[PDB]
């Protein structure tokens, strides 16, 4: 099974600054990574699909990058509503797996 490493587990950023979450796969998985946001007491919410493809209704502030084993989720100018846990998920090989998650602090 593919291990998704999200390090660091906590990201601390000043308001309006660009921030980047990291997701590293234990093997090359092309672009088959997807990014979800989970706020407190909420269900996960698809932010990015296939490493970089935008989702309807997600602010243009969010973007994604990378291929192979190293992937990045970026937020340009962070704001308070971004405070949440962020998870990556791979669909390249069965079974689908999740990263351990990175918390965003402001």
């Amino acid at each position: 099974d593919i291990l998704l490493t999200q390090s660091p587990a906590i990201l601390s950023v000043s308001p309006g600054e660009r921030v980047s979450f990291s997701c590293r796969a234990s093997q090359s998985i092309g672009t088959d990574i997807h990014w979800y946001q989970q706020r407190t007491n909420g269900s996960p919410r698809l932010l990015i699909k296939y490493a970089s493809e935008s989702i309807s209704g997600i602010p243009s502030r969010f973007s994604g990058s990378g291929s192979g084993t190293d992937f990045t989720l970026s937020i340009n100018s962070v704001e308070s509503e971004d405070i949440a846990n962020y998870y990556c998920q791979q669909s390249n090989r069965w079974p689908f797996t999740f990263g351990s998650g990175t918390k965003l602090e402001i």
């Binding site: 669909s91 090989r93 069965w94 079974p95």
Partner: protein
């Protein structure tokens, strides 16, 4: 209509059907096998085309018994459909040459 052209068209539509059904059944057979890559329908359709044309790049292939049985069905369907197109072309050429020889 001439039998070879009707058979060519029928083989074309049957091959399209086999491609779609093979994508569906390949995903169905491969999910649950750890390490399987043939597990989403888009790339499964790409793989089915690869398999029917014998242009197998090696980016995707089944690892389970039933996925490989599906693969064999797709292989045979594609090979026989393209061979049937070749046979229809040969029949057309043979008839045209018979007519050109005034026979």
């Amino acid at each position: 209509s001439a039998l070879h052209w009707r058979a060519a068209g029928a083989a074309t539509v049957l091959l399209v059907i086999v491609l779609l059904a093979g994508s569906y059944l390949a995903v169905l057979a491969e999910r649950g096998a750890p390490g399987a890559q043939l597990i989403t329908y888009p790339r499964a359709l790409w793989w089915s085309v690869e398999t029917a044309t014998t242009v197998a790049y090696g980016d995707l292939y089944p690892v389970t018994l039933w996925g490989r049985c599906v693969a064999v069905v797709v292989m045979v369907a594609g090979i026989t459909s393209f061979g049937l197109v070749t046979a229809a072309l040969a029949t057309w050429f043979v008839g045209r040459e018979q007519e050109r020889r005034g026979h």
